[PDB]
Amino acid sequence: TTALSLPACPEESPLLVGPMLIEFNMPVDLELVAKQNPNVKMGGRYAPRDCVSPHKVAIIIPFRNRQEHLKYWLYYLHPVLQRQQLDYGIYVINQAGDTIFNRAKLLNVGFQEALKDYDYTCFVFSDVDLIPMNDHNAYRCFSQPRHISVAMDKFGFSLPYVQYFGGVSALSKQQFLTINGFPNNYWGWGGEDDDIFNRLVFRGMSISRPNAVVGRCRMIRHSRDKKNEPNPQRFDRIAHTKETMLSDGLNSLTYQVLDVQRYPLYTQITVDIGTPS
């Protein structure tokens, strides 16, 4: 007798539906979400049964005190990620304590901690408040670093500037290692997303983007609060990034994991990342 390994999944998934209506006028029951997503296994982990996805994706959400927003995120994204036939896991990196938020350091934590679970080769870094409006917008990696949230409703569906890298992005393991990860030292200063962009183009990379219709995303907010925010200006950090990118990153990532929870729909890692010192 002879066994046959599973086929790799197709380049293009045949399960996609295209555009989706994203609304926030209804409560979310995470137990129902789990029941409606029965193939999602403990810790927010899924892989296709019929095929071997090339996309081994850790989705990393930097987090503090945003549970109700996280529920909407899980409600919308789990169905999309399954339809995209991804071998994926959800990581919510929760910053313990009440010091200034350090988004990029928590992203770096997620990279390192996710790798202790599984041989992931792609990392999606996502704001908890951003939901894609079209499941052709792939939550996985490309030959170039990928900017996923290209047309956000809160910016009028405009891209703030050509170098804008905020919201949702995807880097391969290799892209991330080549840039020495993300800066840990920004804390509340501003510009970590521009720093990351600068790292990538200093390393010869060129940002890839879905087209602007496919790449539309909705910000979680009450309907009464819908409005166009001002587009952000670029932070001036090019020279700074060049000076510091090799000394601030994976090789300076200091943290302690305080507790880990494998909930049905996500893994939460609560961490002490120290202080702006």
Author numbering: 122 to 398
Q: What does the publication say?
A:
Beta-1,4-galactosyltransferase 1 (B4GalT1; EC 2.4.1.38) is a family 7 glycosyltransferase residing in the trans Golgi. In the presence of manganese, it transfers a galactose moiety (Gal) from UDP-galactose (UDP-Gal) to an N-acetylglucosamine (GlcNAc) residue, with the formation of a β1–4 linkage. B4GalT1 possesses a type II membrane protein topology, with a short N-terminal cytoplasmic tail and an α-helical transmembrane domain responsible for Golgi localization, a stem domain (amino acids 45–125), that is believed to be mostly disordered and whose function is still unknown, and a globular catalytic domain (amino acids 126–398) carrying the sugar transfer activity. Previous structure-function studies of the catalytic domain of B4GalT1 by x-ray crystallography revealed that the enzyme undergoes conformational changes upon substrate binding and during its catalytic cycle.
In the present work we used the wild-type human B4GalT1 and our construct is longer than the previously studied ones (Asp99-Ser398 instead of Ser126-Ser398). It contains a piece of the stem domain (Asp99-Leu125) in addition to the catalytic domain (Ser126-Ser398). We obtained two crystals with distinctly different shapes in the same crystallization conditions. In our open conformation structure of the human wild-type B4GalT1, the lid region, the most prominent ligand binding-controlling structural element, is detectable in its entirety. This was not the case in previously published structures of human open B4GalT1, containing mutations R337T, C338T and M340H. However, comparison of the lid positions can be made with the bovine open B4GalT1 structure, for which all residues could be traced in the electron density map. Even though the proteins have crystallized in different space groups and unit cells and the packing of molecules is different, the lid is observed in a similar orientation, except for residues 346–352, which are slightly displaced (RMSD ≈ 2.5 Å, data not shown). One noteworthy difference which is functionally important for ligand binding, is that in our open structure, Trp310 has a new and unexpected orientation with an RMSD of ≈ 2.0 Å compared with human closed structure. The Trp loop in the open structure lies in the vicinity of His361 and Tyr307 and makes short distance (<3.8Å) hydrophobic contacts with those residues as well as long range (≈7Å) hydrophobic contacts with Phe356.
